[PDB]
Structure 1
């Protein structure tokens, strides 16, 4: 819809930053659509990924990092706040120790920093969703 997908935006993150994504799955949960949010170290898509967040709607969520071209230890969660056929609001806060992910205002996942958030230069949002809003909070120093 509003924003093109894959959506790529240059970005800078530090403690206190928040990334807000508003969108909607393209198909019903029965068909297992995915949503993926990757925080990259460079503007190119083949670059390293500081924080990989992949949702298989209705099934599970996978988080990881890709360092020096290699995927590290995957963390898997079965927590599923997303609602079939509904628009969702996803907020990723950068805390000192980890990323906190809220879905529709509810804390749902956390991921301890493996690489400093300051290494992030780009965020890519893709897979089976329509994207209506993308915002990174640049109020803090």
Structure 2
């Protein structure tokens, strides 16, 4: 059963929380589908973003924050553990110092907190994926 995409949910996070996302790119990597995961400070979609995580499948990853409506310093990664045409499991671990993004059980990306974790109140998952699982740990 497919979940809504764009997927928008209320959340509350603290140290030790995990946000788990299972989905599949809509097209082959040759045509560069994207995935975007945004940790927002409010339910409103124009609210600030504590953690912006954008995958250009088969290419690269960009991470950033949007603070008082302004995008801040871009962080890039060339790590690309995602498999063309395959389902992926993203686990975003909320550590004391950073978000850590696991792909299929191993950490490949890290983003030190710029906005306090306790300011996060919504997560939106969108771009060119289908979604079968979105779980915030209890």
Same fold (TM over 0.5): yes
Query: C-alpha displacement at 1:51, in angstroms?
Result: 0.3
Superposed counterparts of 1:69-88, under 5 Å: 69-88=69-88
Corresponding residue for residue 40 of structure 1: 40
Q: Distance in 1 between matches of 2:100 and 2:60?
A: 17
Q: Could you list the runs of 5+ residues in structure 2 that have no partner in the other structure?
A: none
* CA distance in structure 2 between the partners assigned to 1:106 and 1:15 by the alignment: 18
The Cα shift of 1:40 comes to 0.3
TM-score under structure 2 length normalisation: 0.99
Separation of aligned partners in 1, 2:41 and 2:106: 28
- When the two chains are superposed, the root-mean-square deviation of aligned CA atoms in Å is 0.6
User: What SS does structure 2 have at the residue aligned with 1:118?
Assistant: helix
Shift of 1:39: 0.3
Equivalence for 1:121? 121
Distance 2:55 2:130 in 1: 14
SS of equivalent to 1:30: helix
Alignment of 1:1-141 (within 5 A): 2-138=2-138
- DSSP 3-state at the match of 2:118: helix
Structure 1 residues without counterparts, runs of 5 or longer = none
Deviation of 1:116 (Å):
0.7
| TM-score, normalization by structure 1 | 0.97
CA distance in 2, matches of 1:25, 1:58: 11
1:59-117 Cα deviation digits (max 9, x unpaired): 00000000000000000000000000000000000000011110001110111000111
